[PDB]
Structure formats: structure tokens, C-alpha cells
Design an enzyme around this catalytic site. Structure first.
Site, short mmCIF file in Angstrom:
data_model
loop_
_atom_site.label_atom_id
_atom_site.label_comp_id
_atom_site.label_asym_id
_atom_site.label_seq_id
_atom_site.Cartn_x
_atom_site.Cartn_y
_atom_site.Cartn_z
N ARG A 211 5.76 -9.10 -5.20
CA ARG A 211 5.15 -8.44 -6.35
C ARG A 211 3.72 -8.09 -5.98
O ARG A 211 3.27 -8.37 -4.90
CB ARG A 211 5.10 -9.39 -7.55
N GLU A 226 1.51 0.05 -9.71
CA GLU A 226 1.96 1.01 -8.70
C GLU A 226 2.42 2.30 -9.34
O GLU A 226 2.94 2.29 -10.45
CB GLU A 226 3.14 0.43 -7.91
N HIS A 244 6.24 0.62 -1.41
CA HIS A 244 7.33 -0.28 -1.83
C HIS A 244 8.70 0.06 -1.20
O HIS A 244 9.64 0.47 -1.89
CB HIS A 244 7.42 -0.33 -3.35
#
Lengths: 277, 277
Positions: A211, A226, A244
Site C-alpha cells: 500500500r 495514486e 502500481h
């Protein structure tokens, strides 16, 4: 069915074969979508989108919500249950690849693969560090945690971890708490502070995969808020960053799609979906 | 002694302790260097610089040329021998790290770590590929070759290699020739063509760690004519590049320096240097 999100072209094709697919996101099927509402029994979605209660209430026949992913914050689990709807996921499929990226980022910081790549590309052409004999502390020894540790053993690294529980069959050492872990790590792998960061020392590095000058580096694939991400990172030093991409491989996404297909045909087959949660 | 090249500050300090060191490259000791010529018995150098015959002829007392490295093209081996000079190297010290970078570059291409890092840094924020179950073909199963293969096994890769000879104790398969290897590889590791490149197919990639749209990628740490390197690379796509950083770690350079120190004190100790070649 209701396709809330795009998935891979070939997960798409597997759908448009078995199913009349209405994509919530395409304007070109808003009408036929509206029409279909009462005769719609299946939603395919992802963890990020889920299925709001509003939409659920719109779908009287809906019996299954198949999540391409394992995230459930975007759907009311019990509420579906009370409407007797099966909500499925795609477990045990992505940990390895997330652990690959974690290691990749690690080598990347260790061996200056970012700073090194641009300097050649920026026609600009500092000694790096070997992982061998260095302590890898793993924060969260789950699936991703175990995968990452074994991969790290191949580089001559000694595994230590924080824990939740102790793992049988390996010779990895367990530390009582996260700070205990930091004070005994050369690379910290986050797989679930200032003082923790400070206990890693000036040679140590942090690698994020979960995370969102006191440390020698960091490889981050996940950040808070994000993708409107701090900004200082792109400026920071000894930093490798990823959009990510933990699970972003074709194989993983293909493994996840097949699962999603499996729970589908199961339910339409009168059975209880295998990945119901 | 004659220090032809800079080495690490702390390999330096180990020298300026035991030895009166004259650096060929510093103007500030050209005089005292000239003076010392007849009473100079030791040269420390690197593979790239070596020691020309001219300089050798200048050093009548010279008994040892200690090479920080394993390269010998820059020194006349037999000529030193005829002058009874011991020429040493630093064997078996760098293969692991070269194999680390090879893997790092691999994950880098596989998982778009370059393209991915800039896109975040370039505030611009494509699915990657997993290594698991993919054929890694290794070109040259030497030290670096073996190190790299085992590391690649941890990622769920199946090893194949070209060979020179067959290796006992492992279940890796050997291919008759380099093209045979290519036709059976998903990632080609060069650890020692067009047709070879072509046999890798459009999904395959090439990873260089030795010397200088039909392929899906490449990670190159070594190129022909360096560092005035092609230029198209920095433009090419799906490419990670390194300023020849195979052995560039502190640990390796420290391991190499200690070796260089060892051959030194040995010779001044009236013994035959252990790494004489």
C-alpha cells in the site's frame, strides 16, 4: 452480463462468446444495456470499480458478481448475500509476480539500474551494492512475502521476517516486531516509520509492494494517493518507481480472467461459484 | 610502487600505508616518480591500462605487476616472464555480481522497469511478462553462466544452455549449438545473429553481460565500441542499458583490491605471488 470494466481483449472475447455483454463504460450500448436490466444475471467487474448498491438494486435477476481481483471494498458483500447473489474473487494468482517486481525493484536500487540507464540514454556516460550476504527483512510473511524471500535466498541473502506467525520448514529468523526487523535488515521488503527508516541505517533500503539522506534508497510500486503521487519522488534520489505494476503481467491477468470465467459458467450452470467470498 | 590507475579510496589507503605510491596519472608526483624508477619493484594496474613494454623497460627492479582484474591484453605476459616479473590477477571474484546485473536487466525488460519508471517520473502515469515457466537459454555456461541460471531457477524458469561442456548435478538441458539454443529460449542470456535473434521470436529477449520489431526486448550492459555506443539504443524500444556495470559493486571491488594487496605483500615477502598467470 454487465461488464463494468474493460478487461483484456481476450478475456473480452471469452465473454462475447458465452455472453451478451453490455459494457457500462461504452456509450454505444447504453440503450441495449437499459433494456437488458431485468434480464441481466451477471456482473463482471474489478476490485476498483466493484458494484454500488444503486446498480445492484437495478439488477433484480443478478445472481453473481464476479470480481477480476480480490478487492471487496467496492461491493457490499452481505447485501449481495441477502439478495442471494454470489460474489466471487480470484485468489492465489498474483503473489508470485508481485514478488518478482519487488525483487526487480530491489536489484534496481541495489545496482542503480535507473540512474544507470538514463546516464547512458542521456548520453552522460557510482559503484553499486551486491545483495549477497545482506539481511533481507520481510514485512508481512504472507504469500507475496514467502515468494519474495525464497527468490532473495538465491542471491545469497539471509532471510528475516515479521511475522504474524512463524513459518515451519525454513531456517528464516523471526523478529518480535517491525522495528526489531528494521534494526536487523539491510533491505526492508514491505509485503503486508521514521524510526523504522532510521533503524535501517544509511546503507539500508526500502522496497514497497503493498500500500501507500538517512536511507540509501527505495523502490516503490505503490504510493499514498495514486496516481497523484507526491512529486518529490520523481525528484528524490536513489529511487525506482512503478505505476502500481505488481500484478501487471499477461500471465497473471490471464490467470485471473480464467478464474472470472470459471465462476461465471459455474453459476449459470446452477452451481455455487467456487470463488464465492 | 607504480599505481597506473586510481582504485577505490580504501584500496588506495591500504597502499599508501605499506607502500610509497607514485601515481602515473597525477602530475603532482611526476618528479618523485621519475626519481623512483630504478627503485620501483611493483606496479598496480587494471586490465584496461595494463603496462606497456615501454614502461616495463623503464622499470629495471620491477618484479610484480598486480592486475586489479583478470584482463591481460594490456600487458605482455611472456615478456614479463623473461624479465622474471610476476603478473597476477584477481580470479573468481566477480561472476556472481555480473550474474546479478544480468538478472536485474532481465526483470527490467520483462517487467518494463525502465519504461515504467520514466512514465511516473515524466508525470505520464502496458502489461509486462512473468519469467515463470519461461525458457532461459544461457550462452556460455561458465562461472557467470552457472550463477545466472540458478538465480533464474528461483523465478520458476527452466534452464537450457550452450555449453562447451555438459554440467553434472543439475537437470538443465544442453543444446548442440547456439541457434539450437535460441530456437528453444524465451530469454537468451549471453554469458560467453539475425538468425539467432530471429529464432528467439517476437516474444523473446536478449540480455548481454559479456562483450559487444523481431524481438520483444533487450537489456545490455556491454556494447561494441564503448562508450561511444550506437546511439539508436537510447532511441530503441524495450531496452534497458548499463554503463558496463557488471562488476561495479563495492563488495566486488573490495574483494578484488584485497586480492591485489595479497599478491603484493606476497612478492615483497620473497614468495611467488598466488595469482600469478
Amino acid at each position: 452480463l454487465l461488464l463494468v470494466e474493460p478487461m483484456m481483449p481476450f478475456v473480452m472475447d471469452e465473454l462475447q462468446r458465452n455472453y451478451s455483454v453490455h459494457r457500462l463504460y461504452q456509450a454505444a450500448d447504453r440503450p441495449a444495456l437499459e433494456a437488458a436490466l431485468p434480464s441481466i444475471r451477471a456482473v463482471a467487474t474489478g476490485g476498483g470499480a466493484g458494484l454500488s448498491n444503486e446498480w445492484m438494486e437495478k439488477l433484480p435477476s443478478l445472481g453473481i458478481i464476479a470480481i477480476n481481483g480480490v478487492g471487496t471494498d467496492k461491493v457490499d458483500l452481505a447485501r449481495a448475500r441477502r439478495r442471494n447473489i454470489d460474489v466471487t474473487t480470484t485468489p492465489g494468482v498474483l503473489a508470485d509476480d508481485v514478488a518478482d517486481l519487488g525483487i526487480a525493484l530491489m536489484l534496481a536500487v541495489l545496482r542503480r539500474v535507473g540512474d544507470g540507464d538514463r546516464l547512458v540514454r542521456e548520453g552522460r556516460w557510482p559503484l553499486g551494492h551486491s545483495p549477497k550476504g545482506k539481511r533481507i527483512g520481510v514485512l508481512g510473511l504472507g504469500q507475496i512475502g514467502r515468494a519474495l524471500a525464497s527468490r532473495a535466498e538465491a542471491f545469497g541473502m539471509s532471510v528475516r521476517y515479521w511475522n504474524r506467525s512463524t513459518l515451519s520448514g525454513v531456517d528464516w529468523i523471526a523478529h518480535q516486531s517491525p522495528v526489531d526487523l528494521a534494526r536487523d535488515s539491510d533491505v526492508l521488503a514491505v509485503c503486508v516509520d521514521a524510526s523504522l527508516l532510521q533503524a535501517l541505517g544509511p546503507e539500508g533500503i526500502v522496497v514497497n509492494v503493498a500500500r501507500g539522506g538517512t536511507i540509501a534508497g527505495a523502490g516503490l510500486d505503490v504510493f499514498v494517493n495514486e496516481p497523484a503521487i507526491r512529486s518529490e519522488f520523481h525528484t528524490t534520489p536513489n529511487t525506482v518507481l512503478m505505476p502500481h505494476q505488481g500484478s501487471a503481467t499477461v500471465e497473471t491477468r490471464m490467470a485471473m480472467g480464467k478464474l472470472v470465467l470459471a465462476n461465471l459458467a459455474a453459476h449459470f450452470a446452477g452451481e455455487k461459484a467456487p470463488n464465492t467470498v
